[PDB]
């Protein structure tokens, strides 16, 4: 092509590299600020779980650990996604796995039940026809427990009163800052715990059952919030690595186009010199 042809594409690709690098820096700072909330959350979850470790053992339960396990009636499923893209296959992995597993295990809309977080999940389920019940459209880049608390309370209440059988949350974990992958876990029935008794005889000032009946929903809300924090960290790491690879590829394209431009302009120049020399020689 021409030098005029090459320059425009070089300009566009350089601007793209600039924008991608800027977004990478922003995501880096966001990840740094995002890990602090997980650090703050860990003690709360551990301190509630250690109390559970003796309060919730040795008893039938309040239909949470009883494993009411109604076979198939809109058992809940939690999907946590981003709101803006540029994260690679981050949202695609979660939505793909959720759709495949839910279509394999369930086959009637009355047996189905989904709760979704983020815009892209809704934007994809509109392409599909799934029965969404409720949603949270946006969440600040540093979400607190109180930010999601009301919807967590709504979902746990729907689990209560026999309306919802049991819940699974599907979200992304991260092995490191560079690798993020999916997990799912069966949440409300709480099939696993550990046993230790310190003040097991009397921690129960109103009674044994009453404190448990209200302690369990708050515990489930804490679990959902922890999953949310892990999903947010995975999202920021994913955008970091995606923008890094995008900038690398754009720089490779810069290198190729620049070599082509430099090699074409030299041929044009030597053509001009040949024309001058021949014109002089003709006289």
């Amino acid at each position: 092509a021409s030098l005029r042809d090459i320059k425009t594409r070089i300009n566009a690709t350089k601007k793209t590299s600039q924008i991608t690098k800027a977004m990478e820096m922003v995501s880096t700072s966001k990840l740094n600020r995002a890990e602090q909330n997980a650090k703050s959350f860990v003690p709360y979850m551990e301190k509630i779980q250690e109390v559970v470790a003796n309060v919730a053992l040795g008893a039938g339960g309040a239909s949470h650990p009883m494993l009411v396990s109604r076979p198939v009636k809109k058992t809940g499923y939690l999907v946590i996604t981003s709101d803006r893209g540029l994260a690679g296959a981050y949202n695609s992995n979660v939505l793909r796995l959720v759709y495949q597993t839910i279509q394999k295990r369930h086959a009637s809309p009355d047996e189905y039940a989904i709760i979704v977080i983020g815009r892209v999940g809704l934007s994809f389920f509109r392409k599909r026809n799934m029965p969404v019940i409720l949603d949270i459209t946006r969440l600040p880049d540093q979400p607190s427990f109180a930010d999601i608390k009301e919807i967590a309370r709504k979902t746990v209440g729907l689990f209560a009163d026999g309306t919802f059988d049991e819940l699974y949350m599907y979200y992304n974990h991260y092995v490191s800052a560079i690798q993020q992958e999916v997990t799912e876990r069966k949440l409300l029935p709480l099939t696993d715990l550990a046993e230790n008794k310190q003040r097991t005889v009397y921690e129960f000032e109103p009674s044994q059952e009453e404190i448990l009946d209200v302690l369990l929903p708050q515990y489930a809300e804490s679990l959902i919030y922890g999953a949310l924090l892990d999903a947010k960290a995975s999202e920021h790491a994913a955008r970091m690595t995606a923008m890094k690879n995008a900038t690398d590829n754009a720089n490779e394209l810069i290198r190729t186009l620049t070599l082509s431009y430099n090699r074409a302009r030299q041929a044009a120049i030597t053509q001009e010199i040949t024309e001058i020399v021949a014109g002089a020689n003709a006289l």
Partner: protein, 119 residues
């Protein structure tokens, strides 16, 4: 001769839409190369999906190319070309594999080839 009063409004519309889709696909190449395919919006994905199939369907097996390749060749009327490209544009054959369209004649041979490959 590519004017509506000469070839017909349907022919003109089909040709202009095909050229528009191909130009968009040409323009998207650099962003596909650097930012990946998945980052494309939902409409641009459909544009690429249709554009590759049109680009392959433009190929044809000639009678005198029987010497080079075993395929015997085909002769395609303008009406059949127009109808086939219109059907491709309106998304009738979005589910066929890309290689089904390559080096065939009328639109029905694409269906037959896909059936042979199991689609």
């Amino acid at each position: 001769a590519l004017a509506p009063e000469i070839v017909g409004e349907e022919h003109y519309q089909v040709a202009r839409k095909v050229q528009q889709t191909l130009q968009r696909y040409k323009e998207l190449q650099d962003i596909i190369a650097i930012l990946g395919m998945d980052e494309l919006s939902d409409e641009d994905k459909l544009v690429v999906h249709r554009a590759r199939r049109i680009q392959f369907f433009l190929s044809q097996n000639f009678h005198v190319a029987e010497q080079f390749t075993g395929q015997p060749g085909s002769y395609v009327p303008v009406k059949e070309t127009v109808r086939g490209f219109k059907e491709i544009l309106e998304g009738k054959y979005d589910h066929l594999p890309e290689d089904a369209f390559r080096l065939v004649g009328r639109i029905e041979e694409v269906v037959e080839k896909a059936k042979a490959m199991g689609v």
